[PDB]
């Protein structure tokens, strides 16, 4: 796309608000919505098969944007340009719950609070004018992913590091395993992505929330994501950490993410 002037005038700025609910593995609108199922662990890389529901997948949506009021006789067209966003992890408040079927601090004395949600935090969101471009990369290439999940079958040993042949695009919600796909830095010219990972299984989650924080989406040339087909593409994963039962079974807990995106009209050839 050849990028020209910002289009100013009334109705040249618009704002969308959207949510993505987490896809930690357990089915929608059933009792464990927001959790994975209890995590089983293989004995060997050669006999490793994570059952469906026991691992998180990326959340993704395309938002239909307002009509642009195109200049019919112009050589150029208008595109919605994402210039900034606010994003918040919602429901951070629920993590003050230390009474709901949790392994207790002093379990052998049957006493104390629940241990609450602890362990790894993976927080990533992406905002783009097209689907997020992905690099396939896995901890163990011999893992057999279930048929429900979108992966590269038989990826080979090279997939445990960078292999330029192992590409994909985030085209579906709740099926691309977080542990098998990451943003592709060789692409995503038309998307901004941000991730943080904090590991461990006893690590305290650290989360902030405010309605006062803006992130600029303009690149070094002052150009934000340009919305192809008048679609805004939102992607995230928000693993907060693990829920531990009394019997020590552990499951991923996730939280939904809020997006507010400010878009302006851009002239393109």
């Amino acid at each position: 796309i050849e990028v020209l002037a910002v289009r100013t005038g009334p109705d040249s700025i618009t704002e969308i608000e959207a949510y993505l609910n987490p896809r930690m593995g357990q089915p929608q609108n059933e009792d464990f919505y927001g959790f994975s199922d209890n995590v089983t662990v293989s004995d060997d890389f050669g006999s490793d098969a994570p059952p469906w529901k026991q691992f998180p997948c990326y959340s993704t949506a395309r938002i239909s944007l307002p009509m642009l009021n195109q200049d019919m006789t112009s050589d150029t067209i208008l595109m919605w340009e994402a210039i900034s966003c606010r994003t918040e992890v919602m429901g951070v408040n629920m993590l003050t719950n230390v009474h709901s079927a949790q392994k207790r601090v002093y379990e052998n004395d049957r006493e104390g609070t629940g241990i609450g949600v602890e362990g790894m935090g993976y927080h990533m969101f992406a905002i783009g004018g097209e689907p997020l471009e992905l690099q396939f990369m896995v901890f163990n290439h011999r893992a057999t992913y279930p048929a429900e999940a979108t992966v590269i079958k038989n990826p080979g040993a090279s997939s445990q590091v960078f292999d330029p042949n192992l590409k994909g695009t985030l085209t579906a919600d709740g099926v691309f395993p977080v542990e098998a796909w990451g943003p592709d830095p060789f692409k995503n010219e038309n998307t901004r992505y941000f991730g943080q990972y904090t590991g461990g299984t006893q690590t305290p989650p650290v989360l902030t929330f405010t309605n006062t924080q803006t992130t600029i989406l303009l690149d070094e040339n002052g150009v934000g994501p340009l919305c192809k087909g008048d679609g805004l593409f939102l992607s995230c994963a928000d693993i907060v950490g693990f829920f531990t039962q009394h019997n020590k079974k552990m499951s991923f807990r996730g939280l939904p993410r809020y997006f507010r995106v400010t878009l302006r009209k851009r002239v393109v050839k």
Copy 2:
């Protein structure tokens, strides 16, 4: 509201100071004020019923500003906020499980574990999203919750809304600020989890937060009311017998307001 120019003049600027005491669960002005009761844990999400006093609720107050009456409204432009009583956490003598419990020796372990620190300043009640760890939790009569909220309440459900209209009855673990509303409120929150996490608190009288949005407009005080909200969970208090309670701290608010003309 269509917002016009800041109305300058004598007594155009005012300033309020307020405190909000914590609502950690134990009754006001009795021996465990500032604490929850000892936390009990359910064996299943199906049979989860947190008794009244065992969980914290949000604090809220409405501050009467000077009557004013295009109309004039009070606009919140800046604020200072402090957690008060951080000094008390230097107490490691008061009935605390000891570092070397089996040698009956050492200091108390003091207050540790999760920190949840949030405040809000607005010209109307804080707009809330209902969201729970376990939708099947049965909250007590004293608590304001959405009864039988359903499985979608464990993540974001756009039907599950409320507003912070009463002090010390909205469970922290059941309500958070709604980012889809609150256009006339600024809110700020941090959570640090765990049960043995070291608390970290700063205090100074030197730090100001600006409450103006991108357009230079602060919260506009509907009915000449300034709405203040917070929760300040510092961590857990552990008894010798390993019973654990929430401990909270009061919050100081200084808010500077100016006269603003609105349509």
Copy 3:
């Protein structure tokens, strides 16, 4: 004070330096100076009497400034440098410390660990205090300055429970903190890091300046030509071989720059 203009001139700016030694509980010029005594723990809030020497108290000093005079002159504190001193001593892991591998009588001492409480205040009058305690039923010793029978509301904010920091080494840290409702003529700064096995984190440099001017460009104004310095610097806990634990504190350095201010 109605504050008028900065009085500029040859003798218009002065600098003071002072130290406050910590008040962790053990008596001055004796073998445990800088420490508390070994901490004892009550069984319940109803029978809770922290003995003298077993808890730290605030340090405070009034520095006499050069005597100055419709209007009068007052020293205005415009900036300060403050440092925790003797951070170097915490590299000591040989001095009668519980060992890392106590069961094997092997490894270093565990050193100082646990809670950090670092606070200082610079003002033109005594620091204004809010009384607030973990447990209102605690019986404080005769040596300590507290509000006796403070009531259940002293566990949170009670607007009646006020004091001013008017004596060194007797206001328990665990019973008093800065009053944000007052202190218009004082600047205070504090950080608490809790826990009993937390690593202490301390920095020191001679290159950091804190500006003491308020939003209106006025610093603390020294009433009666007095500059009021306050701090508490709890570094953490010293653990003996027999698992007895004491507070360890460090002294704090102040450099304060003051200018002459005309007031009505």
Copy 4:
């Protein structure tokens, strides 16, 4: 080089992207690619021989830039660099020691312990200082080291120099960037130690590092070659039987260069 004006014109600016795969010890395109072999520990410094495959080495590449030829040289002005595959660390199912290994229950403990993250961009190979924890370590024949380095190699010895001239054979534990040289390279590194430390990793396509020195001169690419180097140790992978291995991640580089006139 004496440095003169920046050359300007249609093709005065070029951008390269490159990846360096990690060199953690296990052979490429085999089943443990990205890991070290299981780490064995010596009994004393005098009998200390870390087997090949059990320790990480530095990754390195020379990128061929467009040929140019007062001479013209490519000047590296800025870069973006990202650790790739951070996503893979959400795997807590693959042959890992479990959180409650005695109960055969809970997630894997995942990757934890030491982080070593460093990268360098230069117009010649990275200049290295040899420095080892134990000078008596006997490195294997596959490794490039200073043999019999002396007790002084446990600290700084100005005799113990090298250059990173080969990928996957300079051990991280024996070579670091030489601050007495690398006038024509920019390096950056972070070490977080321990064996149960939680890894902390961030990734974004939005961060630029400026490579210009105080004089406004970037790395000047000798022989029209751009030299990339890194090491990205994320932590340790722990088996059920408690055998531990280094896990590494590949690094992405984007470097912007401009034509620069020199003597």
Copy 5:
């Protein structure tokens, strides 16, 4: 010193590079160079004698500076003024070693990596125009330091906090105990010092290195350290943590520090 104008001109700016090796206690150019000897612990403050080699001392050097080419007939004097520095802890790379004679993560199973270096980090450097001025302060005043060490003997109970009588100057390398001396904030008008302490015995060391970071040494008056007798005084201590043997004996491990200092000519009266 009456400080006057900066002297500009062709040779008015110079850069020096230097290293200070650590003085952790074990002898130079022997097998444990860079370590302390294994730390013994007293039972009581009254019977406390840290043996020579079991505790780190401060590193210090006077760097001889290039000739100034003085104005022979001028009433004024040129002095080198230290305006900025880069400083780097070197050898951070070596701490990736978890194989050399280290207590293992799973010592009972004789399995896992070494625990590596962990515990306290003490990192201070000072750049001055004269020797660093010290304040004597000890954890325990009744400690008897070895004859090899420079201390104030029988310093009294006041030496456990601030005593204005208990001063010294860092006049020798490898003999001033870190645990007995720190920078005197009441002096050092002609030196800049910087210190960080992170305590504990199992704390993870955190160290960064770059050739891109510069520290300005100018005071509030735009004046850097002025190098008296044309000497630049460099000091540091860089305790990284402890090394733990299989038999649980523990030693300090230190690292060398790199200094690059930029100096300009300053006219003084």
